Each structure stands twice: as C-alpha cells, then as structure tokens.
Amino acid sequence: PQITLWKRPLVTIRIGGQLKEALLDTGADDTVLEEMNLPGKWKPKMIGGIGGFIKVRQYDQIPIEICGHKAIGTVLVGPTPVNIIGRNLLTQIGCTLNF
Amino acid sequence: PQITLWKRPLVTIRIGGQLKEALLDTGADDTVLEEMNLPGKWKPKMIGGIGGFIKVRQYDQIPIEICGHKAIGTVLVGPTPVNIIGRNLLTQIGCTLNF
Ligand SMILES: CCC(CC)CN(C[C@@H](O)[C@H](Cc1ccccc1)NC(=O)O[C@H]1CO[C@H]2OCC[C@H]21)S(=O)(=O)c1ccc2c(c1)OCO2
C-alpha cells in the first residue's frame, strides 16, 4: 500500500500465531513489542529511546506477517509505550519513504 | 525522492537559521529538535517514548525546510538525542510510506 501520515501508520501484524496492532516506525532501528510470550531462546538486551534506556528480551529469527507481507527477524520484547515495527523489518517488507 | 531504510532516514533541515540533520520519523506524532535557543513564545510539554518522558518547549508556527521542501508548524525543543521530524511536518512535505 501507500500510507499517508495524517494518522498514525498502524497496521495489523501476526506473530507467534496472534494478531496485534503495531506502528510502522521509521525512526526505530529495531522492532519492539509490548510484553508478550514468544517461544524459544532469548537474550537480555538494553535499548535507548527518547526518555532513557529499557531492558528488553531479544528473540532472533522470528517470523512476523506485517500488513500481509512476510518478515523473519529480530524482535525485542519489553516496556515500549506501543508496539513498533522498526527498520530491521521495514526493509524486509520493502518499505520506503517517498515524497 | 525515495528513501530506503537500510540506514537511518536522516536528512538536512533548516530551522531558526541553523542547518541540522534530522530523522524522517513516521513513529513521531510531533517534531522534536535538540536544544536550541529559539526566539518567541512557547508552552511546556512532556512527551513520552522508550525510557519515559522528557520535558520540551513547544513553539508554534515555526518555518522549517526539510530536504528542500518548505514546512511550517509546531516544533518541540528539548533534550532529545536526535532531531526528529514527525508526522505534523511529514504530511506537509508530501511524505508517504510505500510497500
Ligand atoms: C510512541 C512511539 C515512539 C516510541 C517507540 C515515539 N518516538 C519516535 C521513535 O521513532 C523514536 C525516535 C528516536 C530515535 C533515536 C533516539 C531517540 C528517539 N525511536 C525509538 O524509540 O526507537 C527505538 C527502537 O529502535 C531503536 O533505534 C532508535 C532508538 C530505539 S519518540 O522519539 O519517543 C517520540 C517522538 C515524537 C513524539 C513523541 C515521541 O510523543 C509525541 O511526539
């Protein structure tokens, strides 16, 4: 699709078998989801945002369907204010900015 | 132009007589610039992200040129680690997400 920006670019995603809403976030290097269970191994990690640093769980090579497009990549889980799809997966689905 | 997301979508902006590098950020409702002593009236605000909130100064109807395109609107000034162009100005320069 082409998505304009007068509203938040929210889309439905499918991960670990479950549907969620997430924000397409070009300012995010990484994809960060709110607290949830995912299967398999994870690593403790820390990431920083506008307000400071948080602790997250890093899950690698996780399949995620984003607005109908498949990605498989790193998903961080932790206390983000909202679910965000970052550039690591935006690149996978062929997302670009255009003006 | 079309901007891929392999790297941070940083572009040159001009504001208050200074040139800066800023993220084209679809995850940002508002535009948030690193501390700078702009003239004029302002109002206090708090904005939240990963890590928590920061205190910013809200300035209205500030002209800003983004990658050669003119815009004018609200800019928040405060201790952000990166200059952030949010949707309030992305819409004004005709920016969309495409995949
Ligand atoms: C609520 C949705 C986002 C937070 C999730 C909002 N952020 C914009 C993001 O794009 C920031 C923009 C940002 C970018 C770098 C540093 C600080 C902020 N990115 C961000 O936090 O990314 C993190 C995930 O990947 C990592 O790579 C970048 C930092 C990490 S924000 O910077 O906190 C932000 C910006 C404008 C706003 C706002 C909050 O509230 C109202 O207006």
TrEMBL record, chains A, B:
GO terms for cellular component: host multivesicular body; virion membrane. The keyword Zinc applies. Residues 20-89 form the Peptidase A2 domain. Its main location: host cell. GO terms for molecular function: aspartic-type endopeptidase activity; DNA binding; endonuclease activity; RNA stem-loop binding; RNA-directed DNA polymerase activity; zinc ion binding. Belongs to the retroviral Pol polyprotein family. This is Pol polyprotein. It comes from Human immunodeficiency virus type 1 (HIV-1). The gene is pol. The chain holds residues 1 to 99 of 400 of the full protein.
